[PDB]
């Protein structure tokens, strides 16, 4: 075995991302444009996968832009913190894509 | 203009749905089976229509049996009680299910 | 209460009818094939629920297929305008599929 | 923190790539086509990312069908077993695509 392979992986993954290298997809929500990767959005998150299966547009209200953004950092870093998005719309944002292990740990501290 | 057409057909719907009649899916929730027809899930949410575009199989722990029974008779009637459940059932499955009036009137009250 | 649900889904079910979303059934009219949904068609008439109970041909001469193409949109849209067809035609297409909300409208209308 | 999360990952990474759904790319090697993710094998490695800057076309002399699948399995798995391979057919093929990890590896136990 090979430890520290994904964290690097996905380190790389993460410079794509900043700098839009390799990104195949854009999501949208309200005025702001996110760039991602297919295989990592459709891995991660059940719904996104069944859409794929290049512009894709969430419900600007369901989901908030900064709650949208950490969770894509979460998504690709495996550490999730907010700013300008609280508890709520994190929550709400990752029931929404299925993100089943941050659901669970947001209802976990929630309560 | 024909009022009530739609109340109706909805009341027809539920019937058929009550006793299993021209359903086209079934949707498992813990070890619990709810029939359903697959155009009125889809029409209701957005996540059900890329789904199916015949069991289809929920995560129990997300969305509890409760919770979807209910949210199912409002599709089909309207009215959403709850009962067995409370509101951070209902809402949480609503969010999964991509059910935004009731995530917004959920939101609403529990503020 | 949800006022405009209905409408949006029907709005929803109007367009998968248009382009043949999620349709399981065909109407043959003349020369002419209009796809439809079992649930929706059975909803609106006893006739059609009896004949569920995929391809369905009706006698071109009793129902004409503009009278026809005028009634399916009636009833994903509420509005049934007479188009190219005679008031007897829309009159008798609405008997003959048990529409009884359009037929007691026709014979208001009929002087 | 949230452990656990990127083996998932790569457990629907893996599954997809078997099944060859979302992928980007082809790489051939002798006469055997392996499907991959242009996003994974340019996270894994330098030259790829160089090469990525639809079908790559590798040098079947140096790269063997054996060692690619060995290593592509390693990619999407973190755990490299040798198949109808051998060590040294392996180490020749990571050195070419850069996988420094099993080159180390290799040569640990070759040493």
Same mark, same amino acid.
């Given at each position: 075995?090979?430890?520290? +392979? ?5 380190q ?5 991302? !900043? +700098? ?5 997809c854009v ?8 760039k991602?990767?297919? #295989?990592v959005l459709?891995?991660?998150s ?11 547009? !969430?419900? #600007? ?9 950490? !969770?894509?950092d @979460? @998504?690709?870093? #495996?550490?999730? @913190?907010?700013?300008e ?5 994190v929550?709400?944002?990752?029931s ?7 659901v669970?740990?947001?209802? +976990?501290?929630?309560?």
């Open positions: 075995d090979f430890p520290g +392979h994904f964290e690097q992986i996905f790389q993954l993460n410079y794509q991302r !900043l +700098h839009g290298q390799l990104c195949d999501i949208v929500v309200g005025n702001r444009h996110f991602a990767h297919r #295989s459709a891995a991660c059940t719904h996104f996968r069944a859409l794929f299966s290049n512009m894709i547009q !969430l419900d #600007s209200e369901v989901v908030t832009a900064e709650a949208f953004a950490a !969770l894509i @979460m @998504m690709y870093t #495996s550490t999730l @913190m907010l700013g998005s609280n508890v709520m719309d929550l709400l944002a990752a929404h894509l299925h993100l089943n292990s941050v669970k740990a947001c209802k +976990h501290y929630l309560t």
